[PDB]
């Protein structure tokens, strides 16, 4: 499958955070090989250096605008009929929401503005594009309509998916996404939030349809399941299973050949058609640069490495 992995280190919160007991070193992108590497070391044992390689590594100097310079090329492929998935993964506090939802800057608002710029540019070629979206969340494996039964309906014919009784909204201009985001708006830290965009183009005779799924995943922090109870226990179990399944599915899709467990989780089942075929997927792993989070950071980088496809690994 067409999969890529980016890592992003957010700036440290000053005076409140520090890197006194660990080191995260990011190397310059290697034009010759097409990948970027980094090394993580814990002060308790500096002899053990954990190295990782990804398609791109954004450091603390990389702003949301800098990040989209890479992401724009991916999301525009939806105008050609490609389905696109972008997953922001990382512990709570690592920067997933800032990356995906920062006002005007986030991958979501940026994606919408970029698509409309392209839509206007494609009119000269006789293309007429219509845009509609949905904004849902999956919590404890249940779908919730943030723009408000919800059953997943896979159309094996057109290889598309819809969800019953979920509000869908037209987007006639990039400025309208404001109403959507405003409507939709801790809990979100324990759920997967999914912004779905459908691009329907007609050239009065070519036709094209592509879907973008921009996901802000539930926090990946490791919670000792043996130490939680009640609602916390149930959510931990569901987040663990869901994230584990996602990793397994993406890893399998990146292999040269298999029984991909799409049905093992609500998120992967919902997105199966946007994860298969010639669909393009980008895993965005957010990490903190600080020492207090080094263990979770290593966990996140290990997840990122697992989802790296055999294009790189
Ligand atoms: N790239 C960034 N640049 C500046 N601040 C950031 C960046 N990423 C995260 N932050 C800040 O770090 C904190 C973590 O934010 P958030 O995105 O909500 O994390 P998460 O969604 O992973 O739990 C916030 O106060 C946010 O404003
Ligand atoms: N799976 C993907 N994830 C993230 N970005 C992608 C993906 N596929 C393509 N892109 C984006 O589109 C650009 C070029 O697309 P592609 O035809 O695959 O050429 P290249 O070989 O340079 O990646 C990339 O530089 C990247 O920014
Ligand atoms: Mg968040």
Q: Is 14 annotated as a binding residue?
A: no
254 lines ligand 1 (CB under 6 A): no
CB burial of residue 86 (10 Å; 0-12, 13-18, 19+): buried
Q: Which of 87, 95, 103 to mutate to test the pocket of ligand 1 (most atoms within 8 A of CB)?
A: 95
Q: 280, 82 in Cβ contact below 8 A? A: yes
Residue 8, C-beta contacts closer than 8 angstroms, at least 6 positions apart: 57, 58, 62, 67, 95, 99, 284, 285, 286, 287
Q: 93 CB less than 6 Å from ligand 1?
A: yes
Q: Of 186, 311, 193, which is closest to residue 255 (Cα–Cα)?
A: 311
Is 189 annotated among the ligand-binding residues?
no
Q: Residue 228, Cβ neighbours under 10 Å: how many? A: 14
Going by the DSSP 8-state scheme, the letter that residue 166 receives in this structure is -
Rounded to the nearest angstrom, the distance between the alpha carbon of 41 and the centre of ligand 2 is 30
Residue 281 labelled as part of a binding site: yes
Nearest to 5 by CA among 221, 269, 251: 251
Angle at 69 (CA atoms; ends 160, 299), nearest 5 degrees: 75
Nearest CA to ligand 1 atom 16: 95
* 56-58 and 2-9 strand pairing: parallel
120 a known binding residue?
no
Closest CA to 188 of 93, 70, 293: 93
Contacts of 61 (CB under 8 A, 6+ apart): none
- Ligand 1 atom with the shortest distance to the CA of 63: 1
Alpha carbon of 98 to ligand 1 centroid (Å): 5
Side-chain half-sphere exposure of 54, counting CA atoms within 13 A: 28
Resolution in A: 1.3
Of residues 16, 6, 181, 194, the one with CA closest to residue 90: 6
234 alpha carbon – ligand 2 mean position (Å): 38
Residue 90 is encoded by which pair of tokens? Answer: 């990382």
Ligand number, closest to the Cα atom of 284: 2
> What number of H helices and E strands is found in the chain?
7, 14
Question: Contact 202/215 with Cβ under 8 angstroms?
Answer: no
The DSSP string of 122-162 is HGGGT-EEEEEEEEEEEETTEEEETT----EEEETTTTEEE
Burial tier of 271 (Cβ tally within 10 Å: 0-12, 13-18, 19+)? buried
Is the CB of residue 5 less than 8 Å from the CB of residue 54? yes
CA distances from 26 to 44, 69, 300 (A): 20, 19, 16
Orientation angle between helical segments 266-275 and 230-253, nearest 10 degrees: 20
**H-run or E-run covering 50:** strand 49-54
Nearest CA to ligand 1 atom 25: 93
Determine whether the annotation assigns residue 56 to a binding site: no
Is-contact 6 87, C-beta < 8 A?
Answer: no
Residue 203 Cα distances to 119, 120, 224, angstroms:
12, 13, 55
Q: Minimal CA–CA distance to 41: which of 20, 15, 11?
A: 20
Please report, for residues 92, 139, 224, the alpha-carbon distance to residue 234 in angstroms, rounded to integers and kept in the order given: 18, 10, 12
Q: Which residue has the tokens 């990122």?
A: 304
2 is annotated as contributing to ligand binding: yes
> Which among 6, 8, 9, 10 is the best mutation to test ligand 1's pocket, defined by most ligand atoms within 8 Å of the CB?
10
Q: Could you tell me the sign of the dihedral formed by the alpha carbons of 286, 134, 80, 243, in that order?
A: positive
- Rounded to whole angstroms, the Cα distance separating 179 from 198 reads 17
For the chain, breaks with the C atom over 2.5 A from the next N come after 148, 185, 204, 257
Strand, helix or coil at 4?
A: strand
Method used experimentally: X-ray
DSSP 8-state class, residue 93: T
Pairing of strands 142-145, 152-155: unpaired
Q: What tokens appear for 288 in the block?
A: 């903190």
Determine whether the shortest distance from the Cβ of 96 to ligand 1 is under 6 A.
yes
Give Rg (Cα) of the chain.
Answer: 19
CA distance readout (Å), 167 to 31, 85, 97, 146: 44, 20, 22, 8
Burial 25-52 (b: 16+ CB within 10 A, else e): ebeeeeeeeebbbbebbbeeeeeeeeeb
Q: Does the C-beta of 11 come closer than 6 Å to ligand 1?
A: yes
Report the candidate in 216, 217, 220, 189 with the shortest Cα–Cα distance to residue 299: 220
- Dihedral angle over CA of 30, 32, 35, 37, nearest 10: -40
In angstroms, how far is the first alpha carbon of the chain from the final one? 14
Domains plus CATH for the chain?
A: 1-313 (3.40.850.10)
CA of 176 to the centre of ligand 1 (A): 24
Q: Are 262 and 279 in contact (CB under 8 A)?
A: no
φ/ψ bin of 303: left (φ > 0), alpha (ψ from -120 to 50), beta (otherwise): alpha
In the numeric block, which tokens belong to residue 253?
Answer: 């899709």
User: Alpha-carbon distance 155 to 80, whole Å?
Assistant: 20
Sign of torsion, CA 240 308 98 193? negative
Cα(288) to centroid of ligand 3, in Å?
Answer: 13
């Amino acid at each position: 499958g067409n999969i890529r992995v980016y890592c992003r280190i957010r700036p440290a919160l000053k005076n409140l955070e520090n890197s006194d007991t660990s080191l995260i070193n990011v190397n310059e992108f290697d034009d010759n090989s097409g990948v970027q590497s980094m090394e993580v070391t814990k002060i308790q044992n500096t002899a053990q250096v954990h190295e990782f390689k990804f398609d791109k590594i954004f450091d603390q100097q990389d702003t949301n605008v800098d990040v989209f310079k890479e992401v724009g090329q991916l999301v525009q492929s939806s105008l050609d009929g490609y389905n696109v998935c972008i997953f922001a993964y990382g512990q709570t506090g690592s920067g997933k929401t800032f990356t995906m939802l920062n006002p005007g800057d986030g991958i979501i608002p940026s994606t919408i503005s970029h698509i409309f710029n392209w839509i206007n540019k494609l009119k000269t070629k006789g293309w007429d594009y219509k845009v509609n979206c949905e904004f849902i969340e999956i919590y404890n494996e249940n779908i919730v309509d943030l723009l408000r039964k919800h059953e997943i309906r896979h159309d094996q014919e057109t290889k598309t998916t819809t969800i019953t009784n979920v509000t869908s909204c037209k987007l006639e201009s990039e400025e309208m996404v404001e109403i959507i985001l405003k409507k939709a708006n801790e809990h979100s830290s324990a759920s997967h939030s999914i912004f779905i965009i459908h691009l329907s183009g007609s050239n009065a005779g070519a036709h094209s349809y592509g879907t973008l799924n921009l996901v802000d995943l539930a926090g990946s922090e490791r919670i000792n399941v043996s130490q939680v109870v009640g609602d916390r226990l149930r959510e931990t179990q569901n987040i663990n299973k869901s994230l584990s399944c996602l990793g397994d599915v993406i890893h399998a899709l990146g292999q040269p050949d298999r029984h991909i467990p799409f049905r093992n989780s609500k998120l992967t089942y919902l997105l199966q058609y946007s994860l298969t075929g010639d669909s393009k997927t980008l895993m965005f792993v957010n990490i903190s640069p600080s020492s207090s989070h080094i263990n979770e950071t290593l966990n996140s980088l290990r997840f990122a490495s697992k989802v790296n496809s055999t294009r790189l690994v």
